[PDB]
């Protein structure tokens, strides 16, 4: 038994969820998605990205967790 580390890919996709949180708190709104994705440019419009915030926060609490940038990036649902 050598020792398998779990830390490099986990700190890559969670480090990007830390680019969401400008004041450092662990949950976000519409503009954080668009803002750091805005540095690139982004293929989607602001109407398509407002439909996305309504899809995943269905009930309407306020702000999203580690599981939305992490959980939609990992699992791809086939049709």
């Amino acid at each position: 038994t050598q020792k398998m580390s779990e830390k490099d890919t986990k700190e890559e996709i969670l480090k990007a969820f830390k680019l969401f949180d400008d004041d450092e708190t662990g949950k976000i709104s519409f503009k954080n998605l668009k803002r750091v994705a805005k540095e690139l440019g982004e293929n989607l419009t602001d109407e398509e990205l407002q439909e996305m915030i309504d899809e995943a926060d269905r009930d309407g609490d306020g702000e999203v967790s580690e599981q939305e940038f992490l959980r939609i990036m990992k699992k791809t649902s086939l049709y």
């Binding site: 890559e12 996709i13 480090k15 990007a16 680019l19 969401f20 998605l33 750091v36 994705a37 540095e39 690139l40 982004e42 293929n43 989607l44 398509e48 990205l49 996305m52 899809e55 995943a56 939305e68 940038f69 939609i72 990036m73 791809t76």
Partner: peptide
């Protein structure tokens, strides 16, 4: 789509060429 915006914000390090 949150999958298209997840690659778009997977940008975390850089891009390339």
């Amino acid at each position: 789509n949150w999958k298209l915006l997840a690659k778009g914000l997977l940008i975390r390090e850089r891009l390339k060429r």
